[PDB]
Homo-oligomer: A and B are copies of this chain.
Amino acid sequence: SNNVKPQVFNPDNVMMHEKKDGTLMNEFTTPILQEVMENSKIMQLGKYEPMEGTRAFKLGVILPVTKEFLNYTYSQFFEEMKPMIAEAFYKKFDEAGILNQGNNPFGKSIAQSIEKTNKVIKGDFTQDNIIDLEALLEDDELEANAFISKTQNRSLLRKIVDPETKERIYDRNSDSLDGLPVVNLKSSNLKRGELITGDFDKLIYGIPQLIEYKIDETAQLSTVKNEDGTPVNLFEQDMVALRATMHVALHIADDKAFAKLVPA
């Protein structure tokens, strides 16, 4: 529109060419990847299950962009944002399935399995506590397959050495503990001193609908209010939006297959 102050949106999720202070991102240099992509950990550890139809639940998001931004500031925005959305979905799914966090829709999670079976070790990281953690699984004829850890505790793992072989139990190059691979979770909910392990083949997942993307220049975003409170009309307000959706399903076949180590 002829508005010389930029449009304030509520919530402020719309991408804009002009900042609130009047700065204009003309000739704007494309951002660069300061971090690597975080793959889904339950899609890495767990067992895939061929599934037809839906239990499943639907993930989704919408990204609105001001077409000024899409023309002058960053033309390829939607092509470079697609994988970042996929990462957001993987993180939401991992956080729901593992930690029972983020308003998970399933009634199932590893955190709930552990809280039910009380398979928790109070203690600092020591070779004896690692062996006890593993024995909590082998007690029930199940053998540990991998470890889940907050990367910030490698400082603790390097301090553990086998007093028989007199060598590090943790291979800091392989990132494997006692010969088992350790995967790192970037989420803020798993605390520094916490470690999880289990036979992840007992954790089953399915994906009835792979991540689908649709770009639209016409819809109305009921959820995004103009400053006056009217809903955003993409066509009249010269705006564009990307919709992404996915269906994921999670199942835990045996909830005693998981154990957790936590600080005393």
Residue ranges of A at the interface with B (Cβ–Cβ < 8 Å): 53-54, 58, 68, 71-72, 208-209
Q: Which chain B positions have C-beta within 8 A of A58?
A: 68
Closest residue on chain B to residue A209 by CB atoms: B71
> Which residues on B sit within 8 Å (CB–CB) of A68?
54, 58
A-B contact pairs, 6 of them (CB 8 A): A53-B72, A54-B68, A54-B72, A58-B68, A71-B209, A72-B208
Q: How far is the CB of A70 from chain B (nearest CB, A)?
A: 12
Provide the residues of chain B in CB contact with A209, threshold 8 Å. 71
CB distance from A59 to the nearest CB of B (A): 13
Chain B residues with CB under 8 A of A208: 72
Q: Would you give the shortest CB distance from A77 to chain B, in whole angstroms?
A: 15
Closest to A52 in B: B72
- Give the residues in chain B near A71, CB-CB below 8 Å: 209
Chain B hits for A72, CB < 8 A: 53-54, 208
Please name the 6 residue pairs, one residue from A and one from B, whose CB atoms are nearest each other, closest first. A53-B72, A54-B72, A71-B209, A72-B208, A58-B68, A54-B68
Closest Cβ neighbor of A245 among chain B residues: B67
Interchain nearest-CB distance for A62 vs B (Å): 15
The chain B residue with its CB closest to the CB of A54 is B72
Contacts of A54 in B (CB 8 A): 68, 72
Closest Cβ of chain B to A112, distance in Å, is: 26
Q: For residue A53, which residue of chain B has the nearest CB?
A: B72
The interface residues of chain B lying within 8 Å CB-to-CB of A53 are 72
Q: Which residue of B lies closest to A73 (CB)?
A: B53
